[PDB]
Recover the amino acids of this structure.
């Protein structure tokens, strides 16, 4: 039993290892999205920058879980991170819709991880998830939904072009 | 009779209490408008900010009347402020049209209040209304009418999107 | 079902709409208190400023709930905000005592809303209430209780006058 | 007929000469009040400074009427300014009460002067009175009434001493 370990169950420890893989997978997806909009036949630089920043955020999510795992005395066990499920992401609207579905899947996985901590009485782990992950997911899911509405509002062509300029930095 | 009271008729005092309620009602309407454009399925942040500022202006209108009531020796009597007459405000054009109708109703109520002061010989109250309310209403009604014209000019979709960016801060 | 909606129950959504009305009602009460101490026959400017700041805080409470409602995918439904239950608030001590009773009623309503979120498994909503509302209520209820003790200590007349100068900014 | 004279009736011109005398009389009263509280057997330096500032304000009122008289083409005719009706002004409360009665007498005289301008169709003179005199009188009468309430609240002795320190600069 590691020196720091206290009120930290193996099932909680295993759940954190699974979430690390998912955050790394989300990071991979956004990286793929970013460079897809960097293609010469797509060429939307706001979308490119937007998904690069989102990719880096997900990397921070994974590493903060790695750091937390060590803090509690758990042991990180890494797995293959799968390639994303598409090679091309359609229009800006399509990519944004994919991004919402991704964020909602990470959110449910986080809520499932909270439940493991709750049933195990991991009072600290629950507040860690609440403060550092659950709040951010809710903000991100709202922002992305707004983006979806506006990409539908502006339409294709010039509309998508201007959204790239005015809604993304 | 309160210490400051001089040339201040009960009918003028009652009129100010009625106007306080209306300014508070306008404030409530704009608050509702602001957060309606903050819905994920509306998501126009310029409209949201625009109506939040207008809501706060109306709150200032109500409180300045409360302050004036005390200055003259009157007594503030508050009433229920009704919920606004809609829960959803349509398009940006629809909301702007509603906002013009609201401002013109407050304006007529102010002009009716001026008439109470005029017939009662309340020379100071008349100039207070003129300087601090009538001028602002005329400016606001012109600004809103311009906004209506431009929302008709740009049309729905991308047009409404760009008005949100270029005409509202 | 709105785009962001996830782990957000209609009963939680309805509870937030009820709390919005209560925060708006508290805001109305403090506004009434503020201008009551601005009467020429009351004329305590520290109490006036103190309750104006408290009124604005309650307005922020209501609007942050409106913002949160939209974040989760709920729909804001506004209701009449009732006039406060008094037109005059007595002495500084009386007003402070009323203010404590008000804050404790909002607190219980918040704790009742936490229970709705808890039973529904709304992990994020619970931490939102904890971080942004429950902590502030506990601070405010302590501050007000201290004020009550000191208004009893100083007594009426000069004592109430000096409390207005030394305990309120 | 003087070069500037236009829409300026002799009755309006005579009314301004009467008001000049009254403003000068108010200035004299406040001067007497100021130095009364400077007596070694009164010795309240906040009251002394407070009435000195009020005296200087009244002097400005008289001179602005003198300036306005010349602007319209009227001719200033000065009269004896009577000594104030008391030589000693009692307590701080007594002096404040006298000061309220004085300000309300000047106010009624101003409202009577507005009526002369109104019946004569002196549109400019009416707004001059409104902007530069009527607003200030209403502010001053409210401030003084507040002071009366607080001098009653604190009582004699230490209370009057502390009002001199905390309510007057
Ligand atoms: Fe993440
Ligand atoms: Fe994310
Ligand atoms: Fe208004
Ligand atoms: Fe307005
Ligand atoms: Fe609150
Ligand atoms: Fe509060
Ligand atoms: Fe004067
Ligand atoms: Fe004066």
């Amino acid at each position: 039993e590691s020196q720091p370990r206290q009120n930290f169950k193996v099932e909680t420890e295993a759940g954190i290892n699974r979430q690390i893989n998912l955050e790394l997978y989300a990071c991979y997806c956004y990286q793929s999205m970013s460079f897809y909009f960097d293609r010469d036949d797509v060429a939307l630089p706001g979308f490119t920058k937007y998904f690069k920043e989102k990719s880096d955020e997900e990397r921070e999510h994974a590493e903060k879980f790695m750091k937390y795992q060590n803090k509690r005395g758990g042991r990180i066990v890494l797995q293959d991170v799968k390639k994303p499920d598409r090679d091309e992401w359609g229009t800006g609207l399509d990519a944004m819709q994919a991004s919402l579905s991704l964020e909602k899947n990470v959110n449910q996985a986080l809520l499932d991880l909270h439940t493991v901590g709750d049933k195990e009485g991991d009072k600290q782990f629950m507040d860690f998830l609440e403060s550092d992950y659950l709040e951010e997911q809710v903000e991100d899911i709202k922002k992305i939904s707004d983006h979806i509405t506006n990409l539908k509002r502006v339409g294709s062509g010039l509309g998508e072009y201007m959204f790239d300029k005015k809604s993304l930095d």
